[PDB]
From a paper:
PDK, a member of the GHKL ATPase/kinase superfamily, regulates the activity of the pyruvate dehydrogenase complex (PDC). The PDC represents a central control point in cellular energy metabolism in that it links glycolysis with the TCA cycle by catalysing the oxidative decarboxylation of pyruvate to acetyl-CoA in the matrix of the mitochondria. The four mammalian isoforms of PDK (PDK-1,2,3 & 4) reduce PDC activity through phosphorylation of specific serine residues in the E1α subunit (pyruvate dehydrogenase). PDK isozymes have been shown to be over-expressed in clinical cancer specimens and this augmented expression has been correlated with poor prognosis as well as drug resistance.
Another compound, VER-246520, a close analogue of VER-246608, demonstrated a comparable biochemical and cellular potency profile as well as a similar binding mode within the ATP site of PDK-2. A similar profile of enhanced compound potency under glucose or serum-depleted conditions was observed with VER-246520.
Residue numbers in the entry:
A (entry chain A), B (entry chain A): 6 to 33, 35 to 169, 177 to 304, 314 to 366
The structure:
Amino acid sequence: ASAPKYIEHFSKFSPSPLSMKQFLDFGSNACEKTSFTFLRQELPVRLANIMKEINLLPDRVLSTPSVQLVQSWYVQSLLDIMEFLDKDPEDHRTLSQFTDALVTIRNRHNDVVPTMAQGVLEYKDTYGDDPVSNQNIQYFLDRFYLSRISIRMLINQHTLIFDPKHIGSIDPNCNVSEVVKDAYDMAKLLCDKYYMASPDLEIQEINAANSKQPIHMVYVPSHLYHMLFELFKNAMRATVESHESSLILPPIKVMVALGEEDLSIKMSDRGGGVPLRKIERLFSYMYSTAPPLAGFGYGLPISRLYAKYFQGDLQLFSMEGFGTDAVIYLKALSTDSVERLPVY
Amino acid sequence: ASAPKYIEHFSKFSPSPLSMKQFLDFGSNACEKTSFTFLRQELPVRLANIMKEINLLPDRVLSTPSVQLVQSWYVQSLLDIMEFLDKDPEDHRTLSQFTDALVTIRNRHNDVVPTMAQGVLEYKDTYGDDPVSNQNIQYFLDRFYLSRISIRMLINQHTLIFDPKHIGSIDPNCNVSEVVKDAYDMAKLLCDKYYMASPDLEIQEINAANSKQPIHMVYVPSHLYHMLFELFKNAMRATVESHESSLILPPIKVMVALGEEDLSIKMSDRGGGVPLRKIERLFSYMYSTAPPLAGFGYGLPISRLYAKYFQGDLQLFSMEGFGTDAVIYLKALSTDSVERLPVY
Ligand SMILES: Cc1cnc(Cl)nc1-c1ccc(N(Cc2ccc(CNC(=O)C(F)(F)F)cc2)C(=O)c2ccc(O)cc2O)cc1
Ligand SMILES: Cc1cnc(Cl)nc1-c1ccc(N(Cc2ccc(CNC(=O)C(F)(F)F)cc2)C(=O)c2ccc(O)cc2O)cc1
Ligand SMILES: CC(C)c1ccc(COc2ccc(CC(=O)NCCN)cc2Cl)cc1
Ligand SMILES: CC(C)c1ccc(COc2ccc(CC(=O)NCCN)cc2Cl)cc1
Ligand SMILES: [Mg+2]
Ligand SMILES: [Mg+2]
Ligand SMILES: [Mg+2]
Ligand SMILES: [Mg+2]
């Protein structure tokens, strides 16, 4: 077969980050043929870039069953996409079987996270969990997961639009507060199920330039939901367990600020907090992988990748003895919301 | 002369970080001879370590008048200290002229900050202000200033004690709130002088393990004052200028938390804040050097060195459109308060 030639050829290209605008433009008025011709070039570049990095991992990592299985998904997905390079954009059955091919590729990779998690486990027990190992895992998974988010975003844009308010997974009129409430509601439901107390929510908005207006943005609200949900679940765990022997339960307080450049979402809790020393660990794939609410959500590392993905960030800071603020930093202006892709 | 042999010899040694305990022990019951024999070894190691680093700077930096002048102070101070190596600890005139020598050395170096500032200016205008330059300046000055804080601390411990509550510059019973109030009071005074409005203060304490108790610690309260004062001055500037056309002026809110491991001091303002993109810049010697309240205080970079100096930190996070939290993280337990010295 040809996977290594394909990988080599296509990793000579640089991925092409898209902006929100570019996304919205692909997504109306059936630009279908256009999405197609972009994607058949772009997905291989993206796939191959990460595949090259996978192949450069040391052999004692690369020969593990978990990496072998993922190496195998990428090869197959890259080949499935190949089939279409020389095919004819005007032929509607071409467009059709390409959408089928996208769905199948998306399915094939649904379980990477737990797959990678086993590889981390194997390596931790097999070579150790020293700081150097940790940085290398962190470095590799951040890139790899960031890479993964970007590909799933391309595929979802195409399959949702090519099967009027929403544009695939982008809401050009996202109501930030609405998403905060829904993710709160869902985390509370879980909370009340496993603890039979749950804190209230208090939302405050600060729309600097327009005192009055509800705060809206162009965003991928499924992403924003992932991040809010992870954050609520942690804050609820903290708050509830830290107040078992007490009567008053602090609310969880969220602030939504709209500046010239940032849209920031702070979520404050009084769960007793974490010492500065132990904070980075929460972001570590290595330390946050071991063999109640613990089962739910995308995790802090991935939540932060979602924020970084459109040039934002997710940060924590705590006051041990008191509680923790978690802030999601997003770009307020759609013209600043451009894909951030691992550097090659 | 012998400066380069001395530098080489003494940079073969590693500085010896001291803990609060070690500091308190030198500082009572006249351990004077002991402080003397420690210092005559330790100061040269410390001086020489930084001097070695100064000599490794590229020539286009090293040949500048500002660096030449500082290179010259260190040489002289290292030599003044040399005079004592073979001298006799039992002779009281020895002890005496050594204290004189310490005072003189401290004076000789009083003006490094503005000296270094001219070197940064020269280099910025002479070679540019690109990101690489910036990291190298940051790296060098952090180390150099951290080095400087540690030496001044040794000298001040000796000269204050060898000329009962306080122990030189260490207060084994520092009242954190007291220092917050005093630095607030001083920053307000300045504020009212240049603006004729100034925000109020609100202090809240959270003593996790002892709900009741005022929060106390073993610290160098002059340091804690430097950091609180810089932070108040910024928060007052922000708050006041951001509310000129408005009637209500938010207070500046400080929280003092005492955990198992951290003592944290958060100072919150509603000055409108800073976008995430521009935050690191506030810590940059390069960008925060250009040719009202602006004249006062030690600066953010040095304030953070003071916090790092005893294994703590100083961090900022803002919500553009709203305001800024600044948190000083200190070690709650004196057994964790050990000098952090630049690595060699
Ligand atoms: C990482 C994580 C994953 N899943 C779940 Cl359910 N929780 C966490 C989690 C949650 C809170 C924390 N802590 C530390 C913490 C841990 C446990 C507790 C509960 N208290 C106790 O267990 C105690 F035993 F002391 F009583 C409080 C705080 C925080 O301070 C915190 C961190 C992130 C965040 O977004 C929000 C936060 O509040 C750490 C881990
Ligand atoms: C670094 C510094 C040094 N000296 C002085 Cl007097 N001030 C500052 C300073 C202060 C505040 C900021 N800003 C940004 C800022 C700058 C200006 C203003 C005032 N508003 C305006 O000038 C406006 F023009 F928009 F109205 C508000 C915020 C902050 O958000 C902030 C930073 C650190 C800190 O500890 C506290 C802070 O509040 C930046 C620089
Ligand atoms: C399965 C995934 C999560 C995973 C598991 C484990 C790893 C571990 O990766 C390491 C560990 C140590 C070193 C230093 C070193 O030895 N360098 C020289 C090259 N051998 C390099 C790498 Cl790439 C990465 C990704
Ligand atoms: C005066 C103080 C504040 C000061 C002023 C200026 C500097 C600047 O230092 C630089 C700038 C660029 C580089 C890259 C490079 O050229 N590397 C190869 C070696 N030439 C290295 C260094 Cl050490 C430091 C400290
Ligand atoms: Mg598309
Ligand atoms: Mg963080
Ligand atoms: Mg001493
Ligand atoms: Mg910071």
